[PDB]
Short mmCIF file of N, CA and C and ligand atoms in Angstrom, two decimals:
data_model
loop_
_atom_site.label_atom_id
_atom_site.label_comp_id
_atom_site.label_asym_id
_atom_site.label_seq_id
_atom_site.Cartn_x
_atom_site.Cartn_y
_atom_site.Cartn_z
N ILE A 1 -12.37 20.89 -16.73
CA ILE A 1 -12.07 20.49 -15.91
C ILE A 1 -12.89 19.34 -15.33
N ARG A 2 -12.69 18.17 -16.09
CA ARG A 2 -14.08 17.50 -15.89
C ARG A 2 -14.60 15.64 -14.94
N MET A 3 -15.50 15.18 -14.35
CA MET A 3 -14.75 14.24 -14.01
C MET A 3 -15.20 13.23 -14.32
N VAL A 4 -14.49 11.95 -14.25
CA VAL A 4 -14.70 10.81 -14.81
C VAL A 4 -14.78 9.68 -13.65
N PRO A 5 -15.76 8.42 -13.38
CA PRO A 5 -15.63 7.69 -12.60
C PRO A 5 -14.61 6.57 -11.90
N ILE A 6 -13.93 6.52 -10.87
CA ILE A 6 -12.61 5.83 -10.14
C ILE A 6 -12.73 4.51 -10.84
N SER A 7 -13.78 4.22 -11.64
CA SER A 7 -14.05 2.58 -12.16
C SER A 7 -12.53 3.15 -13.15
N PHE A 8 -11.97 3.87 -14.39
CA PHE A 8 -11.11 3.95 -15.11
C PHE A 8 -10.33 3.90 -14.10
N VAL A 9 -9.80 3.88 -13.63
CA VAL A 9 -8.28 3.71 -13.08
C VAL A 9 -8.41 2.00 -12.51
N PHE A 10 -9.37 1.90 -11.43
CA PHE A 10 -9.69 0.56 -10.53
C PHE A 10 -10.24 -0.50 -12.03
N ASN A 11 -10.77 -0.91 -12.82
CA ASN A 11 -11.00 -1.46 -13.52
C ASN A 11 -9.74 -2.60 -13.63
N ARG A 12 -8.31 -1.23 -13.99
CA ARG A 12 -6.98 -1.90 -15.12
C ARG A 12 -6.82 -3.20 -13.81
N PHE A 13 -7.06 -3.26 -12.37
CA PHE A 13 -5.71 -3.67 -11.84
C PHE A 13 -6.05 -4.96 -11.27
N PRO A 14 -7.61 -5.89 -11.54
CA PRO A 14 -7.72 -7.10 -11.17
C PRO A 14 -7.00 -8.09 -11.94
N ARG A 15 -6.44 -7.71 -13.61
CA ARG A 15 -5.59 -8.85 -14.65
C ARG A 15 -4.32 -8.36 -14.60
N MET A 16 -3.76 -7.56 -13.34
CA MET A 16 -2.42 -7.42 -12.96
C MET A 16 -2.70 -8.49 -11.90
N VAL A 17 -3.99 -7.79 -10.76
CA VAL A 17 -3.32 -8.88 -9.59
C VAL A 17 -3.41 -10.25 -9.81
N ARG A 18 -4.21 -10.55 -10.13
CA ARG A 18 -4.59 -12.10 -10.94
C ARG A 18 -2.88 -12.47 -11.64
N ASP A 19 -2.66 -11.77 -12.24
CA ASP A 19 -1.28 -11.86 -12.79
C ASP A 19 0.37 -11.95 -11.95
N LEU A 20 -0.18 -10.98 -11.24
CA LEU A 20 1.18 -11.21 -9.86
C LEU A 20 0.77 -11.85 -8.83
N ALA A 21 -0.37 -11.78 -8.85
CA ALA A 21 -0.22 -13.02 -7.68
C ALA A 21 -0.09 -14.27 -8.09
N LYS A 22 -0.54 -14.83 -9.48
CA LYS A 22 0.16 -16.37 -9.80
C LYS A 22 1.91 -15.73 -10.20
N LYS A 23 2.42 -15.02 -10.05
CA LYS A 23 3.76 -15.37 -10.29
C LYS A 23 4.52 -16.29 -8.99
N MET A 24 4.11 -15.56 -7.86
CA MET A 24 4.65 -16.36 -6.49
C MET A 24 3.64 -17.17 -5.96
N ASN A 25 3.35 -18.12 -6.45
CA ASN A 25 2.75 -19.05 -5.73
C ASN A 25 1.42 -18.87 -4.82
N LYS A 26 0.43 -17.65 -4.91
CA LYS A 26 -0.11 -17.08 -3.74
C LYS A 26 -1.00 -16.79 -3.93
N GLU A 27 -2.30 -17.95 -3.68
CA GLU A 27 -4.20 -17.24 -4.26
C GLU A 27 -4.61 -16.60 -3.24
N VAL A 28 -5.07 -15.29 -3.79
CA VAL A 28 -5.68 -14.22 -3.77
C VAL A 28 -7.03 -14.35 -3.67
N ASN A 29 -7.68 -13.23 -2.96
CA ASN A 29 -8.85 -12.48 -3.02
C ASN A 29 -9.17 -11.27 -3.18
N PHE A 30 -9.59 -10.64 -4.89
CA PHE A 30 -9.56 -9.13 -4.78
C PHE A 30 -10.45 -8.49 -4.63
N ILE A 31 -11.09 -7.53 -4.12
CA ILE A 31 -12.12 -6.68 -3.84
C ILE A 31 -12.08 -5.35 -4.41
N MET A 32 -13.12 -5.08 -5.07
CA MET A 32 -12.83 -3.51 -5.66
C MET A 32 -14.07 -2.94 -4.77
N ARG A 33 -13.82 -1.57 -4.24
CA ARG A 33 -15.46 -1.44 -3.60
C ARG A 33 -14.88 0.21 -4.14
N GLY A 34 -16.72 0.55 -4.05
CA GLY A 34 -16.14 1.94 -5.00
C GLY A 34 -16.41 2.78 -5.71
N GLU A 35 -16.37 1.67 -7.01
CA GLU A 35 -15.86 1.83 -8.30
C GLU A 35 -16.68 2.84 -8.86
N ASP A 36 -17.66 3.76 -8.21
CA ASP A 36 -18.46 4.97 -8.64
C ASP A 36 -18.00 5.91 -8.21
N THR A 37 -17.25 6.04 -7.66
CA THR A 37 -17.07 7.68 -6.92
C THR A 37 -16.53 7.78 -7.97
N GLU A 38 -16.41 9.59 -7.61
CA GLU A 38 -15.44 9.98 -9.28
C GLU A 38 -14.57 11.65 -8.95
N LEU A 39 -13.27 10.87 -9.50
CA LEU A 39 -12.25 12.06 -9.49
C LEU A 39 -11.97 12.79 -10.71
N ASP A 40 -11.19 14.26 -10.36
CA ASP A 40 -10.68 14.78 -11.96
C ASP A 40 -9.87 13.52 -12.96
N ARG A 41 -10.32 14.52 -14.24
CA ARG A 41 -9.60 12.82 -15.14
C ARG A 41 -8.25 12.90 -14.92
N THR A 42 -7.51 14.12 -14.60
CA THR A 42 -6.17 14.36 -14.15
C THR A 42 -5.58 12.94 -12.65
N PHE A 43 -6.62 13.85 -11.74
CA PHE A 43 -6.24 12.93 -10.09
C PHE A 43 -6.11 11.38 -10.56
N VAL A 44 -7.40 10.52 -11.51
CA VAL A 44 -6.99 9.35 -11.38
C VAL A 44 -5.91 9.16 -12.44
N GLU A 45 -5.81 9.41 -13.37
CA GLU A 45 -4.39 8.53 -14.17
C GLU A 45 -2.72 8.81 -13.37
N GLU A 46 -3.45 9.37 -12.47
CA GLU A 46 -1.64 10.06 -11.64
C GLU A 46 -1.75 8.60 -10.91
N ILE A 47 -2.68 7.98 -9.84
CA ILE A 47 -2.74 7.61 -9.11
C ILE A 47 -2.98 5.88 -9.40
N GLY A 48 -3.02 5.69 -10.48
CA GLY A 48 -2.93 4.28 -11.31
C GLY A 48 -1.69 3.60 -10.81
N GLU A 49 -0.28 4.30 -10.92
CA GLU A 49 1.02 3.48 -10.68
C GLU A 49 0.83 3.73 -9.18
N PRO A 50 1.43 4.95 -8.47
CA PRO A 50 0.70 4.79 -7.24
C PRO A 50 0.27 2.91 -6.73
N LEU A 51 -1.25 3.41 -6.46
CA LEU A 51 -1.81 2.30 -6.19
C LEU A 51 -1.15 1.15 -6.70
N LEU A 52 -0.45 1.00 -8.07
CA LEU A 52 -0.22 -0.67 -8.49
C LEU A 52 0.44 -0.86 -7.55
N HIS A 53 1.09 0.00 -6.93
CA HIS A 53 2.54 -0.04 -6.21
C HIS A 53 2.08 -0.90 -4.50
N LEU A 54 0.77 -0.13 -3.93
CA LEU A 54 0.42 -0.82 -2.98
C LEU A 54 -0.21 -2.14 -2.67
N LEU A 55 -0.64 -2.57 -4.04
CA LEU A 55 -1.30 -3.53 -4.35
C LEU A 55 -0.27 -4.35 -4.19
N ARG A 56 0.88 -4.20 -4.95
CA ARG A 56 1.56 -5.44 -5.15
C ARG A 56 2.52 -5.96 -4.15
N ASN A 57 2.81 -5.42 -3.20
CA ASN A 57 3.25 -5.83 -2.17
C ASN A 57 2.56 -6.58 -1.68
N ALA A 58 1.30 -6.38 -0.69
CA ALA A 58 0.22 -6.98 -0.49
C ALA A 58 0.48 -8.68 -0.76
N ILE A 59 -0.25 -8.11 -2.50
CA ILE A 59 0.36 -10.13 -2.96
C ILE A 59 2.31 -10.31 -2.46
N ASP A 60 2.66 -9.56 -2.89
CA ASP A 60 4.29 -9.62 -2.46
C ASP A 60 4.62 -10.00 -1.84
N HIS A 61 4.20 -9.31 -0.82
CA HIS A 61 5.07 -9.60 1.25
C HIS A 61 3.82 -9.53 1.41
N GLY A 62 2.98 -8.99 1.65
CA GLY A 62 1.45 -8.54 2.37
C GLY A 62 1.01 -10.49 2.37
N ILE A 63 0.49 -10.95 1.51
CA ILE A 63 -0.37 -12.58 1.85
C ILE A 63 0.72 -13.55 1.76
N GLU A 64 0.30 -14.15 3.50
CA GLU A 64 1.19 -15.47 3.00
C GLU A 64 0.85 -16.41 1.93
N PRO A 65 1.97 -17.38 2.32
CA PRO A 65 1.84 -18.80 1.32
C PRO A 65 0.49 -19.67 2.72
N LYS A 66 -0.22 -20.60 1.51
CA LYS A 66 -0.96 -21.74 2.20
C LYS A 66 -0.69 -22.42 3.69
N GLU A 67 0.43 -23.12 3.68
CA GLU A 67 0.58 -23.72 4.43
C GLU A 67 1.22 -23.15 5.95
N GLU A 68 1.95 -21.53 5.90
CA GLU A 68 2.89 -21.03 6.78
C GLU A 68 1.19 -20.69 7.43
N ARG A 69 0.30 -19.71 5.93
CA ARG A 69 -0.85 -19.12 6.49
C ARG A 69 -2.17 -20.02 6.98
N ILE A 70 -1.85 -21.00 6.52
CA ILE A 70 -3.43 -21.40 6.91
C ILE A 70 -3.09 -22.12 9.09
N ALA A 71 -2.24 -22.22 9.20
CA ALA A 71 -1.89 -22.45 10.74
C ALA A 71 -2.34 -21.31 11.60
N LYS A 72 -2.29 -20.04 11.42
CA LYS A 72 -3.03 -19.28 12.15
C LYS A 72 -4.37 -19.14 12.00
N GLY A 73 -5.09 -20.34 11.98
CA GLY A 73 -6.07 -19.63 11.89
C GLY A 73 -7.11 -19.11 11.30
N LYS A 74 -6.23 -17.94 9.50
CA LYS A 74 -7.18 -17.11 8.76
C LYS A 74 -7.26 -18.29 7.94
N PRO A 75 -7.92 -18.19 7.41
CA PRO A 75 -8.39 -18.31 5.93
C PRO A 75 -7.96 -18.52 5.22
N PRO A 76 -7.29 -19.88 4.38
CA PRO A 76 -6.20 -19.52 3.74
C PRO A 76 -6.25 -18.56 2.58
N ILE A 77 -6.91 -18.50 1.77
CA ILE A 77 -7.13 -17.62 0.80
C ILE A 77 -7.37 -16.07 1.01
N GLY A 78 -5.94 -15.83 0.94
CA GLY A 78 -6.25 -13.69 1.17
C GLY A 78 -6.95 -13.04 0.64
N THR A 79 -7.18 -12.16 1.37
CA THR A 79 -7.88 -10.68 0.29
C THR A 79 -7.48 -9.75 0.39
N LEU A 80 -7.72 -9.18 -0.83
CA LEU A 80 -7.11 -7.64 -1.25
C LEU A 80 -8.09 -7.03 -1.45
N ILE A 81 -8.19 -5.78 -1.19
CA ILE A 81 -9.53 -5.15 -1.22
C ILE A 81 -8.85 -3.66 -2.03
N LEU A 82 -9.32 -3.32 -2.58
CA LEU A 82 -9.01 -1.74 -3.20
C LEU A 82 -10.39 -0.55 -3.35
N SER A 83 -10.75 0.22 -2.78
CA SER A 83 -11.77 1.25 -2.34
C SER A 83 -11.36 2.59 -1.94
N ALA A 84 -12.38 2.98 -3.02
CA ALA A 84 -12.92 4.61 -3.09
C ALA A 84 -13.87 4.82 -2.48
N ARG A 85 -14.51 5.59 -1.50
CA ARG A 85 -15.28 6.11 -1.02
C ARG A 85 -15.15 8.10 -1.30
N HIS A 86 -16.15 8.40 -1.17
CA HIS A 86 -16.65 9.75 -1.33
C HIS A 86 -16.94 10.63 0.21
N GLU A 87 -15.71 10.84 0.77
CA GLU A 87 -16.25 11.14 2.03
C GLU A 87 -16.52 13.23 1.91
N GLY A 88 -17.06 13.57 2.17
CA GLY A 88 -16.85 14.72 2.47
C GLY A 88 -16.33 15.46 1.45
N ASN A 89 -15.07 16.12 1.65
CA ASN A 89 -14.58 17.42 0.65
C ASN A 89 -13.53 16.92 0.32
N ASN A 90 -13.04 15.11 0.72
CA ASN A 90 -12.15 14.28 0.68
C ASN A 90 -11.92 12.91 -0.36
N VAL A 91 -11.52 13.15 -1.49
CA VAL A 91 -11.94 11.23 -1.77
C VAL A 91 -10.15 10.54 -1.43
N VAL A 92 -10.98 9.83 -0.71
CA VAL A 92 -9.46 8.77 0.08
C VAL A 92 -9.83 7.65 -0.57
N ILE A 93 -9.03 6.93 -0.75
CA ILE A 93 -8.65 5.60 -1.48
C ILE A 93 -7.91 4.22 -0.17
N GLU A 94 -8.56 3.12 -0.14
CA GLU A 94 -7.51 2.68 0.95
C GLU A 94 -7.41 0.92 -0.31
N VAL A 95 -6.33 0.23 0.31
CA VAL A 95 -5.91 -0.56 -0.36
C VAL A 95 -5.39 -1.14 1.08
N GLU A 96 -6.21 -2.34 1.43
CA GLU A 96 -5.99 -3.27 2.42
C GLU A 96 -6.48 -4.73 1.95
N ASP A 97 -5.46 -5.99 3.39
CA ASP A 97 -4.98 -7.34 2.59
C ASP A 97 -5.41 -8.01 4.56
N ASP A 98 -5.02 -8.81 4.42
CA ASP A 98 -4.79 -9.67 5.45
C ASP A 98 -3.77 -10.22 5.40
N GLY A 99 -2.57 -10.41 5.66
CA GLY A 99 -1.51 -10.50 5.38
C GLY A 99 -0.68 -10.29 6.59
N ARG A 100 0.32 -10.94 6.86
CA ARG A 100 2.02 -10.74 7.98
C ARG A 100 1.71 -9.76 8.29
N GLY A 101 1.71 -8.23 7.84
CA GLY A 101 1.77 -7.28 8.24
C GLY A 101 2.96 -6.88 9.08
N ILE A 102 3.34 -5.54 8.54
CA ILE A 102 4.39 -5.47 8.58
C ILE A 102 4.73 -4.94 10.63
N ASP A 103 6.13 -5.40 11.02
CA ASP A 103 6.57 -5.74 11.90
C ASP A 103 7.09 -4.13 12.07
N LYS A 104 6.60 -3.89 13.03
CA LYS A 104 6.80 -2.21 14.11
C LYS A 104 8.09 -1.97 14.27
N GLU A 105 8.60 -3.03 14.79
CA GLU A 105 9.73 -3.02 15.63
C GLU A 105 11.22 -3.29 14.65
N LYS A 106 10.98 -3.60 13.75
CA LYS A 106 11.85 -3.70 12.76
C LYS A 106 12.45 -2.30 11.79
N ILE A 107 10.98 -1.69 11.57
CA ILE A 107 11.66 -0.17 11.04
C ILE A 107 12.22 0.90 12.05
N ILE A 108 11.99 0.48 13.28
CA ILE A 108 12.86 0.77 14.75
C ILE A 108 13.54 0.53 14.70
N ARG A 109 14.45 -0.82 13.92
CA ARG A 109 15.76 -0.65 14.24
C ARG A 109 16.92 -0.80 13.44
N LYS A 110 15.81 -0.19 12.24
CA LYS A 110 16.49 0.25 11.15
C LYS A 110 16.67 2.16 10.76
N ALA A 111 15.99 2.96 11.71
CA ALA A 111 16.11 4.29 12.29
C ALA A 111 17.41 4.67 12.76
N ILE A 112 17.51 3.73 14.01
CA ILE A 112 18.36 3.79 14.98
C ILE A 112 19.97 3.11 13.97
N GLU A 113 19.66 2.74 13.57
CA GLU A 113 21.11 2.11 12.90
C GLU A 113 21.47 3.16 11.89
N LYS A 114 20.40 3.44 10.52
CA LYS A 114 20.89 4.16 9.75
C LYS A 114 21.34 5.76 10.72
N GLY A 115 20.68 6.19 11.54
CA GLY A 115 21.02 7.38 11.55
C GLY A 115 19.82 8.16 12.00
N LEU A 116 18.91 7.92 11.87
CA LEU A 116 17.51 8.47 11.18
C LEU A 116 16.89 9.13 12.34
N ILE A 117 16.86 8.23 13.59
CA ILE A 117 16.76 9.02 15.02
C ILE A 117 17.46 8.09 15.80
N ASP A 118 17.95 8.59 17.10
CA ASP A 118 18.20 7.61 17.98
C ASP A 118 17.36 7.38 19.00
N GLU A 119 18.22 5.98 19.32
CA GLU A 119 17.14 4.95 20.64
C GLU A 119 16.39 5.41 21.58
N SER A 120 17.02 6.75 22.59
CA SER A 120 16.25 7.04 23.73
C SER A 120 15.08 7.44 23.14
N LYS A 121 14.37 8.39 22.01
CA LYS A 121 13.55 8.72 22.17
C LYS A 121 13.00 7.82 20.66
N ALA A 122 13.01 7.03 20.68
CA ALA A 122 12.58 5.96 20.04
C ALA A 122 10.75 6.13 20.27
N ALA A 123 10.40 6.30 21.76
CA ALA A 123 9.52 6.07 22.78
C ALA A 123 8.61 7.16 22.32
N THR A 124 9.24 8.54 21.37
CA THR A 124 8.67 9.17 20.94
C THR A 124 7.60 9.29 19.71
N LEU A 125 7.79 8.84 18.67
CA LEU A 125 7.20 8.45 17.83
C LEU A 125 6.54 7.21 17.73
N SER A 126 5.53 7.86 17.31
CA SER A 126 3.86 7.07 17.23
C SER A 126 4.12 6.30 16.44
N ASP A 127 3.06 4.75 16.51
CA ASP A 127 3.13 3.78 15.55
C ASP A 127 2.64 4.73 14.04
N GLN A 128 1.87 5.46 14.21
CA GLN A 128 1.76 6.31 12.64
C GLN A 128 3.37 6.63 12.52
N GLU A 129 3.86 7.48 13.38
CA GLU A 129 5.31 7.70 12.78
C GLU A 129 6.19 6.79 11.76
N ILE A 130 6.20 5.18 13.11
CA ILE A 130 6.91 4.22 12.23
C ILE A 130 6.83 4.46 11.14
N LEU A 131 5.83 4.05 10.63
CA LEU A 131 5.73 3.63 9.08
C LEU A 131 5.87 4.67 7.99
N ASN A 132 5.81 5.69 9.04
CA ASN A 132 6.46 7.02 7.77
C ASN A 132 7.72 6.81 7.83
N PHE A 133 8.32 6.26 8.71
CA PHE A 133 9.81 5.01 8.04
C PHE A 133 9.92 4.44 7.14
N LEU A 134 8.98 4.11 6.14
CA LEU A 134 8.94 3.56 5.18
C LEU A 134 9.04 4.73 3.79
N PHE A 135 8.84 5.79 4.10
CA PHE A 135 8.60 6.53 3.22
C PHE A 135 10.08 7.50 3.26
N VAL A 136 10.99 6.89 3.68
CA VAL A 136 12.67 7.64 3.65
C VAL A 136 13.13 6.93 2.20
N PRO A 137 13.91 7.99 1.34
CA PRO A 137 14.06 7.19 0.55
C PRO A 137 15.45 6.24 1.18
N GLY A 138 15.92 5.08 0.18
CA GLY A 138 16.34 3.86 0.51
C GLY A 138 16.64 3.19 1.24
N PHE A 139 15.19 3.65 1.92
CA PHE A 139 14.96 2.59 3.25
C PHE A 139 14.95 0.68 3.18
N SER A 140 14.73 0.41 2.31
CA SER A 140 14.62 -0.79 1.91
C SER A 140 16.26 -1.33 1.77
N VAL A 145 24.44 -2.81 -2.96
CA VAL A 145 25.78 -2.53 -3.97
C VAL A 145 26.36 -3.27 -5.24
N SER A 146 26.84 -4.06 -5.28
CA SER A 146 27.22 -5.41 -6.58
C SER A 146 26.10 -5.61 -6.95
N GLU A 147 25.09 -5.87 -6.67
CA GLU A 147 23.81 -6.28 -7.75
C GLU A 147 22.44 -4.81 -7.35
N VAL A 148 23.05 -4.16 -8.76
CA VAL A 148 21.50 -3.11 -8.45
C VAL A 148 20.30 -3.82 -9.64
N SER A 149 19.47 -3.53 -9.31
CA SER A 149 18.14 -3.68 -9.84
C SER A 149 17.87 -2.11 -10.76
N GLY A 150 18.60 -1.83 -12.06
CA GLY A 150 18.60 -0.42 -12.92
C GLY A 150 16.80 -0.18 -13.00
N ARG A 151 15.92 -0.81 -12.28
CA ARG A 151 14.41 -0.82 -12.21
C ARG A 151 14.02 -1.54 -10.90
N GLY A 152 13.54 -0.27 -10.33
CA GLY A 152 13.27 0.05 -9.03
C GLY A 152 11.74 1.15 -8.79
N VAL A 153 10.49 0.14 -8.30
CA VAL A 153 9.12 0.13 -7.52
C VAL A 153 9.82 1.30 -5.88
N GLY A 154 10.34 2.90 -5.32
CA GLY A 154 9.93 3.06 -4.30
C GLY A 154 8.94 2.72 -3.94
N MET A 155 8.60 2.84 -2.34
CA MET A 155 7.66 3.78 -1.78
C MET A 155 7.40 4.84 -1.55
N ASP A 156 8.51 5.73 -1.98
CA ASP A 156 8.30 7.21 -1.92
C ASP A 156 7.21 8.04 -2.99
N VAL A 157 7.65 7.60 -4.08
CA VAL A 157 7.38 7.66 -5.75
C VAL A 157 5.80 8.25 -5.27
N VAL A 158 5.18 7.29 -4.16
CA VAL A 158 4.10 6.86 -4.21
C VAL A 158 3.52 8.34 -2.94
N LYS A 159 4.05 8.03 -2.27
CA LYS A 159 4.19 9.49 -0.73
C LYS A 159 4.23 10.50 -1.59
N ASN A 160 4.81 10.91 -3.21
CA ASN A 160 4.92 11.81 -3.72
C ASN A 160 3.72 12.71 -4.39
N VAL A 161 2.89 11.38 -5.20
CA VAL A 161 2.38 11.40 -6.33
C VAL A 161 1.28 12.08 -5.03
N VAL A 162 0.71 11.49 -4.04
CA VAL A 162 -0.03 11.71 -2.82
C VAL A 162 0.37 13.13 -2.55
N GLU A 163 1.26 13.55 -2.06
CA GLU A 163 2.18 14.36 -1.68
C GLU A 163 1.94 15.72 -2.70
N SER A 164 2.29 15.00 -4.22
CA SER A 164 2.02 16.33 -5.26
C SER A 164 0.43 17.30 -5.27
N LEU A 165 -0.52 16.39 -5.34
CA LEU A 165 -1.70 16.61 -5.38
C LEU A 165 -2.02 17.08 -4.19
N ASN A 166 -1.65 17.96 -3.02
CA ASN A 166 -2.11 17.67 -1.88
C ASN A 166 -3.01 16.66 -0.72
N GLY A 167 -2.13 15.97 -1.04
CA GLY A 167 -2.70 14.53 -0.43
C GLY A 167 -2.11 13.85 0.41
N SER A 168 -2.40 12.72 1.51
CA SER A 168 -1.96 11.91 2.66
C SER A 168 -1.91 10.68 2.23
N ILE A 169 -0.70 10.22 1.89
CA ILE A 169 -0.65 8.63 2.39
C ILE A 169 -1.02 8.23 3.80
N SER A 170 -0.94 7.41 4.63
CA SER A 170 -0.63 7.05 5.45
C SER A 170 -0.86 5.14 5.32
N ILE A 171 -0.39 4.49 6.50
CA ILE A 171 0.06 3.23 6.55
C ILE A 171 -0.62 2.51 8.22
N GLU A 172 -1.41 1.73 8.83
CA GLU A 172 -2.02 1.72 9.31
C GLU A 172 -0.92 -0.39 9.33
N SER A 173 -0.49 -0.90 10.18
CA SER A 173 -0.72 -2.20 10.30
C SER A 173 -0.61 -2.65 11.43
N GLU A 174 -0.67 -4.29 11.50
CA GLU A 174 -1.23 -4.64 12.87
C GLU A 174 -0.69 -5.79 12.58
N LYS A 175 0.63 -6.53 13.29
CA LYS A 175 1.21 -7.76 12.64
C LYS A 175 0.36 -9.42 12.76
N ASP A 176 0.22 -9.85 11.85
CA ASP A 176 -0.39 -10.91 11.09
C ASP A 176 -1.28 -10.65 11.70
N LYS A 177 -2.50 -9.26 11.17
CA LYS A 177 -3.52 -9.67 11.06
C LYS A 177 -4.08 -8.85 9.60
N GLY A 178 -2.26 -7.97 9.32
CA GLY A 178 -2.70 -7.08 7.88
C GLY A 178 -2.54 -5.96 8.49
N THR A 179 -2.34 -5.46 6.73
CA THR A 179 -1.95 -3.54 6.69
C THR A 179 -2.66 -3.14 5.98
N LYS A 180 -3.16 -1.83 6.25
CA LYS A 180 -3.82 -1.09 5.22
C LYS A 180 -3.82 -0.08 5.05
N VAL A 181 -2.81 0.75 3.44
CA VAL A 181 -2.97 1.90 2.96
C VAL A 181 -3.90 2.92 2.60
N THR A 182 -4.28 3.87 3.30
CA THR A 182 -4.86 5.31 3.16
C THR A 182 -4.36 6.35 1.87
N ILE A 183 -5.02 6.91 0.89
CA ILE A 183 -4.96 7.85 0.72
C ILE A 183 -5.65 9.22 0.29
N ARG A 184 -5.63 10.11 0.40
CA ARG A 184 -6.75 10.81 0.83
C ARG A 184 -6.70 11.77 -0.42
N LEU A 185 -7.24 12.11 -1.16
CA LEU A 185 -7.24 13.36 -2.11
C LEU A 185 -8.46 14.15 -2.40
N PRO A 186 -8.35 15.76 -3.05
CA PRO A 186 -9.26 16.57 -2.72
C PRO A 186 -9.85 16.82 -3.24
N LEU A 187 -11.15 17.59 -3.09
CA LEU A 187 -12.42 17.73 -4.38
C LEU A 187 -13.01 16.09 -5.24
C1 JSJ B 201 14.86 -7.78 1.58
C2 JSJ B 201 13.45 -7.42 0.29
C3 JSJ B 201 11.90 -7.37 1.45
C4 JSJ B 201 13.97 -6.15 -0.16
C5 JSJ B 201 14.12 -6.57 -1.95
C6 JSJ B 201 14.61 -5.33 -2.14
S1 JSJ B 201 13.90 -4.05 -1.64
S2 JSJ B 201 12.20 -2.08 -3.23
P1 JSJ B 201 11.31 -2.76 -2.27
O1 JSJ B 201 10.44 -1.38 -3.48
O2 JSJ B 201 10.34 -3.45 -2.31
O3 JSJ B 201 10.58 -1.71 -0.87
P2 JSJ B 201 9.78 -1.53 -0.52
O4 JSJ B 201 9.59 0.25 -0.03
O5 JSJ B 201 8.51 -2.02 -1.20
O6 JSJ B 201 9.24 -1.69 0.81
C7 JSJ B 201 9.19 -2.93 1.25
C8 JSJ B 201 9.20 -3.08 3.19
O7 JSJ B 201 7.84 -2.36 3.58
C9 JSJ B 201 7.84 -3.42 4.20
N1 JSJ B 201 5.83 -3.84 3.49
C10 JSJ B 201 5.37 -2.90 2.65
N2 JSJ B 201 4.66 -3.45 2.27
C11 JSJ B 201 3.95 -4.62 2.60
C12 JSJ B 201 2.85 -5.10 2.65
N3 JSJ B 201 1.96 -5.04 2.30
N4 JSJ B 201 2.76 -6.45 3.98
C13 JSJ B 201 3.66 -6.13 4.35
N5 JSJ B 201 4.82 -6.00 5.08
C14 JSJ B 201 5.21 -4.80 3.22
C15 JSJ B 201 7.86 -4.65 3.82
O8 JSJ B 201 8.09 -5.77 4.99
C16 JSJ B 201 9.00 -4.77 3.84
O9 JSJ B 201 9.90 -4.45 4.54
C17 JSJ B 201 13.96 -7.90 -2.02
C18 JSJ B 201 12.88 -8.32 -2.73
C19 JSJ B 201 15.03 -8.27 -2.63
N6 JSJ B 201 13.49 -8.26 -0.59
O10 JSJ B 201 13.76 -10.11 -0.38
#
């Protein structure tokens, strides 16, 4: 069991982010931090596709268009950060964007409609719990893209390796997703 820098995976994404950024007419700023931290050849190879998902949404859905984005006083060029820091005995990766932000009450209104939870205990769940509703399958008939990137696939890889994904978000201030990994 042999460890190689997290550079191996991270370095692939910039080309993609640029690619994906250009498809939806959005200019983005991509920052990668902590490339030197190291994980086992296994742990690195798995997370790429999971990480790739989290990046895409930020460009795709996280970062606003210039005209609407320029209005709020935030700089016109959105910023996307992928970082890995070696803290303690756990390896944590984070992806953050200065984006629209996930509207937490939209997730709460979806859990009630679909019966995941009833409304009167909505007060029970914590903000941290609300976004976990992004992890139920099919939270997202006539038409079906035979090809589908789901959020859970990520939750799984993380859960696969004894690891915990998390989502923190603040409407119109941005969202950040975090992946803690052991050893
Ligand atoms: C109606 C909608 C959106 C659904 C589609 C199919 S949906 S399949 P999908 O894989 O896209 O669904 P996701 O499992 O990706 O969840 C995406 C859900 O989470 C939140 N969200 C996740 N990351 C976020 C981020 N960085 N910034 C802000 N919001 C984020 C989003 O507001 C969204 O509501 C298509 C593309 C046709 N379409 O126009």
